[PDB]
Ligand binder design. Structure first.
Ligand SMILES: O=P(O)(O)O[C@H]1[C@@H](OP(=O)(O)O)[C@@H](OP(=O)(O)O)[C@@H](OP(=O)(O)O)[C@@H](OP(=O)(O)O)[C@H]1OP(=O)(O)O
Ligand SMILES: [Mg+2]
Ligand SMILES: [Mg+2]
Ligand SMILES: [Mg+2]
Ligand SMILES: [Mg+2]
Ligand SMILES: [Mg+2]
Lengths: 290, 49, 222, 299, 107, 34
RNA sequence: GUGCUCGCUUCGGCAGCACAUAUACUAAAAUUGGAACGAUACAGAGAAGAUUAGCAUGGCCCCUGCGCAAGGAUGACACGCAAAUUCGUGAAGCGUU
RNA sequence: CGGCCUCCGAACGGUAAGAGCCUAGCAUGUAGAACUGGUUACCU
């Protein structure tokens, strides 16, 4: 059995009011992954929002570093597969019954020897947040998660409970959509979760700077410079990132053309700066010159 | 700021979960170094004995 | 309802408990079900106590429906309490009951042989049911903690499961010899075959134990 | 040591020393008054009883011989520290009497601030009222002037008021606090008076025969208010050297009269600190907080 | 492990619930001021009125019935008096109905 | 993972510890003795 | 909604005061998955020539029992190289420095 | 003036043990559900 002090949850899922009232139940339910009994905490998210419940053990949380009910990552907040890929992690948690119960037992025994402060294992050795992860991250609280379900009655017409229909009396979503059927077990293990694939395709279609053909094209064109930048400022953007060989600050077009001394240095600089080199608030467009 | 209140237990409620699960025992602790005194020799005759 | 929920939760569909709390099979059961469907003294003691109370409350329902009479109710209750032996069959499961049973006989011989001291006859109409009632109430005072323990154990075992991991069963009377030999040959294996060795390679302790058993048979054969 | 005291069931609102520096009195929501010995293990000997409402302010006499204690249940009470027993139940207050002050070194006389709209003057012996200056509204703290001839009070309208006991008119009204004043305490100078107010500012004033006509002297930053609006109280040190304040921030604020610097914002508490008590002899500090216990800090 | 007072927490929570703004609870080691968090402009325009504090509101209360004479056999609505501006049936209509049939077939 | 099973032999019994009295042999006397 | 304002003030309303202060695993569902020792059929019982009593040990095997008692075929299961760190003589023949 | 009047009934140990097989039940009643479209110029 687990025993906790509070949930460990996403701010989205925790609610809007600063003042929340929440109930605990000791040994209340069984972790859908750890398979063992847990303490279950239940809170009312907001006005006219479903009561939510912590749905995974505190150890099953600390292991993969997620929110015990929202299930999304704690820092960035993407599906577990996406975060794993962006951290280039390879999580080896067993699948079959006996092996998984055994692994859970020993992982719990070893997490007993912790400080309760940070995830155990590679989730400390993989906290180097890649710009892909930061780029996919949610920005404001998608609080549409906490509205109630779809009223089978009010979908057939029957929700004769007036306005109190226990579920959102709107149109039912077409079951063909990939974003419909995502079993909890897979969403925790990260094996074929449709939201992960859609978000990954979105991250693949997202703009990133393109590389040139020729090795000798070592002039990099930064578009959208503005006349509040200095040649020394463009340097400080591309100075310690390697070596720069020359800098042409074109004031007749508000752009720049940086000749470097190391191809990998300039490549890392410009790709890492792609539309996001925000110096004095200017959206520069890093590309390889002609 | 959150208000913890513990939920009532129903007096007439049987246990909820299956306790008896069997698994092999975990790995022990990191083996300690064997601080012996150096071994001596057994002649062939002793092993005959 | 509780006893039927128990029966049907164990998945014993071939049995049913009828309305006077008799348990009856509705098939002929093979061995596997004659075994799977045996019940204990907790189940049966609860069954028989409920049967006594149903007898009592149903005598009262007959009174209230208009079927009997005040006098017939009183004497029928006296009957019930005097003859728990021949109406329930409780003694089968907690045989200490005969304390109570013999007591409710002794009382009856008193009361009767003082009830019918004159023209009053040896007939049925004697219901002065205070005494036997008292007796079975004290019995229940005693039995409720016992049965609450036994039923708590049954329900736990039915909902958690039986613990076959660290049972650690005592050494009783059928395991005295087998245990003596367990511990004797554990001792022998500790003793020299690991603490006076220097038959380094493989100290053959599995063969010194063979010598031990044969020395014993040779002792016995002189 | 830290010496945290416990044994109170609800918030403690008021804690103060024997003017000997011998015994400790604390009180709050639990409707009774606990006493302790300041030295040794800081141990509890006595408990005074009777007050039906919350004990909102306890106040000693200047020898330590009888105890005054303002209760929520429309009443003040004077008791015998000799016994702990009631001598007088000052009734007649038409509402919540929050603040009480016994005249020091004058005839035995009491000023009580209440939530009725009046300040009340009472003599202990007569079982009757002396004077009462109904300004308009609730008065939240009240203290005499060392002549026992002016009476100072602070309420909701932010203008600290002082009445002359003989002409019975608003003698001295002072202004400059942005929100409700919650605490007054006149230093043992008989001159300098300290004012806490939940607008987050503390002020110092001086009642004299002649003052600059605008006697807002020293100003310190740091105190807090929040949705609690608990009553916040201040004190001078025995020497007029350090001002101690509490706040709803769990931080004991210790400042100095001289440089107005932040000598301390001490953590250690769990709930709002409602009252800090200075030892009349020692550098000993006692914190009464809404976390249902007290602290005994040594500086 | 805080310990706070009880009327006040529920006061602030109900405030934030029914009015949409609340005295923010951050007890920061940097001294912040009383700031109404949430619907700040609503707190400004409504004068900070709490759901518990009485305040002037000309808001049109929904029309209800009132049949409180308990001698009429099918008369007494009493405390169970329905709202008069309420609907008499709850259902989805022709387009959403056929669409939901199509979805239940698609599933 | 605590069971609610129970045993006839785990009922409370002998719930007070006898201590060795003043004359029997208390650790004070044996501390003294020669 | 209740009462009182020496409220307008008629006995229509309005107002003010007081009193009263936050239910709920929201579902009649809709889901989703596994067992019945039931058929079905196969299957088919330790030791040693034969016939048979049992008590144990081991553990990712259970079942009946309140059970730390007892029972379940001695409850079942438990055997083809159950080979592990590691060699050297004696002679001969052939080719080599 | 004598009196002396036990007990008492049920279970197991006997009628195999097994793999497949397939369908009720019986359990679940959840968690989650999505976001756009920047480009070249001077001296031989
Ligand atoms: O059946 P039992 O438990 O033994 O009780 C009966 C009975 O009592 P109920 O009236 O409650 O049935 C008889 O009572 P009567 O015939 O007197 O009315 C009778 O007792 P009597 O001996 O006095 O007749 C008889 O006894 P027996 O078979 O010896 O006649 C016997 O009581 P016992 O316990 O006396 O046998
Ligand atoms: Mg044989
Ligand atoms: Mg056995
Ligand atoms: Mg046999
Ligand atoms: Mg066996
Ligand atoms: Mg047998």
């Amino acid at each position: 059995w687990e025993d906790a002090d509070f949930p460990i949850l996403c701010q989205t899922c925790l609610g809007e009011n600063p003042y929340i009232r929440m109930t605990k139940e000791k040994y209340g339910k069984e972790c859908k992954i750890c398979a063992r009994p847990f303490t279950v905490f239940r809170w009312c998210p907001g006005v006219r929002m479903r009561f939510k419940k912590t749905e995974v053990c505190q150890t099953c949380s600390k292991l993969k570093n997620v929110c015990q009910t929202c299930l999304l990552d704690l820092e960035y907040g993407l599906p577990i597969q996406v975060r794993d890929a962006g951290l280039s992690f390879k999580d080896d948690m067993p699948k079959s019954d006996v092996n998984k119960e055994y692994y859970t037992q020993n992982m719990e025994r070893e997490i007993s020897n912790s400080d309760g402060t940070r995830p155990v294992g590679m989730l400390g050795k993989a906290t180097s947040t890649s710009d892909m992860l930061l780029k996919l991250a949610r920005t404001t609280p998608y609080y549409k998660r906490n509205r109630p379900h779809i009223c089978s009655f009010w979908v057939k017409g029957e929700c004769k409970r007036g306005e109190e229909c226990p579920y959102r009396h709107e149109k039912p979503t077409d079951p063909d959509d990939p974003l419909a059927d995502q079993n909890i077990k897979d969403r925790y293990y990260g094996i074929n979760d449709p939201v992960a694939d859609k978000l990954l395709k979105r991250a693949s279609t997202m703009p990133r700077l393109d590389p040139p053909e020729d090795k000798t094209i070592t002039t990099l064109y930064v578009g959208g410079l503005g006349d509040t930048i200095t040649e020394t400022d463009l340097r400080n953007h591309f100075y310690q990132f390697g070596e720069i060989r020359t800098i042409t600050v074109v004031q007749r077009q508000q752009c720049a053309f940086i000749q470097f001394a190391t191809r990998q240095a300039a490549e890392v600089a410009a790709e890492k700066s792609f539309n996001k080199l925000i110096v004095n608030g200017r959206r520069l467009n890093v590309k390889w010159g002609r | 700021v959150i208000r913890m209140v513990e939920m009532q237990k129903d007096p007439m409620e049987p246990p909820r979960f299956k306790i008896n699960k069997k698994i092999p025992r975990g790995p022990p602790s990191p083996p300690a170094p064997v601080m012996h005194s150096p071994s001596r020799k057994m002649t062939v005759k002793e092993q005959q004995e | 309802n509780m006893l039927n929920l128990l029966i049907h939760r164990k998945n014993l569909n071939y049995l049913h408990l009828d309305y006077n709390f008799n348990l009856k099979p509705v098939k002929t059961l093979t061995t596997k079900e004659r075994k799977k469907s045996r019940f204990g003294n907790a189940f049966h003691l609860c069954r028989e106590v409920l049967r006594l109370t149903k007898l009592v409350v149903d005598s009262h329902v007959q009174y209230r429906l208009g079927n009997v009479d005040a006098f017939q109710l009183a004497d029928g209750l006296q009957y019930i309490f005097a003859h728990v032996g021949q109406l329930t069959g409780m003694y089968r499961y907690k045989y200490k009951l005969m304390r109570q049973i013999r007591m409710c006989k002794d009382l009856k011989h008193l009361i009767y042989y003082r009830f019918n001291t004159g023209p009053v006859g040896k007939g049925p109409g004697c219901g002065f049911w205070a005494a036997g009632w008292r007796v079975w109430l004290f019995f229940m005072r005693g039995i409720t903690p016992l049965l609450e323990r036994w039923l708590g154990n049954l329900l736990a075992r039915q909902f958690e499961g039986r613990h076959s991991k660290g049972v650690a069963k005592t050494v009783t009377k059928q395991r005295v010899e087998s245990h003596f030999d367990l511990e004797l040959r554990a001792a022998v294996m500790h003793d020299i075959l690991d603490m006076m060795p220097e038959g380094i390679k493989q100290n053959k302790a599995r063969t010194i134990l063979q010598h031990l058993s044969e020395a014993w048979r040779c002792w016995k054969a002189n | 040591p830290i010496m945290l005291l416990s044994g109170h069931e609800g918030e403690v609102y008021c804690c103060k020393f024997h003017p000997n520096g011998s015994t400790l009195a604390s009180a709050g929501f639990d409707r009774l008054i606990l006493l302790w010995n300041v030295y040794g293990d800081c141990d509890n000997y006595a408990t005074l009883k009777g007050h039906s409402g919350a004990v909102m302010e306890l106040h000693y006499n200047t020898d330590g011989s009888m105890l005054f204690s303002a209760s929520t249940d429309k009443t003040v009470a004077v008791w015998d520290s000799e016994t702990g027993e009631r001598v007088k139940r000052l009734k007649g207050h038409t509402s919540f009497v929050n603040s009480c002050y016994p005249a020091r070194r004058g005839p035995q006389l009491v000023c009580t601030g209440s939530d009725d709209g009046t300040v009340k003057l009472w003599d202990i012996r007569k079982k009757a009222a002396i004077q009462t200056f109904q300004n308009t509204y609730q008065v939240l703290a009240v203290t005499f002037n060392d002549t026992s001839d002016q009476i100072i009070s602070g309420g909701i309208d932010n203008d600290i008021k002082v009445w002359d006991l003989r002409q019975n008119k608003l003698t001295y009204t002072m202004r400059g606090h942005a929100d409700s004043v919650t605490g007054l305490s006149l230093s043992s100078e008989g001159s300098y008076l300290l004012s806490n107010a939940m607008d987050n500012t503390v002020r110092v004033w001086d009642v004299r025969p002649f003052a600059p006509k605008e006697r807002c002297v020293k100003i310190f930053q740091g105190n807090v208010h929040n949705f609690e609006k608990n009553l916040l109280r201040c004190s001078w040190s025995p020497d007029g050297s350090k001002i101690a304040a509490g706040s709803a921030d769990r931080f004991v604020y210790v400042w100095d009269t001289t440089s107005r610097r932040i000598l301390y914002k001490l953590p250690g508490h769990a709930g709002s600190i409602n009252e800090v008590a200075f030892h009349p002899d020692e550098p000993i500090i006692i914190s009464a907080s809404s976390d249902k216990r007290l602290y005994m800090g040594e500086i | 492990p805080a310990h706070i007072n009880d009327f006040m927490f529920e006061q602030q929570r109900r405030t934030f619930a029914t009015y949409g703004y609340a005295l923010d609870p951050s007890l920061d080691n940097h001294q912040v001021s009383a700031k109404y968090i949430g619907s700040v402009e609503e707190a400004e325009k409504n004068q900070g009125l709490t759901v518990f504090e009485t305040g002037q509101k000309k808001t049109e209360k929904r029309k209800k019935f009132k049949e409180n004479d308990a001698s009429n056999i099918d008369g007494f609505l009493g405390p169970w008096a329905k709202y008069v501006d309420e609907k008499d049936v709850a259902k989805p209509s022709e387009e959403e109905q056929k669409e939901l049939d199509e979805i239940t077939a698609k599933r | 993972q605590l069971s609610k099973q129970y045993s006839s032999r785990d009922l409370p019994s002998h719930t007070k510890i006898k201590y060795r009295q003043t004359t029997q042999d208390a650790p004070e006397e044996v501390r003294n003795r020669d």
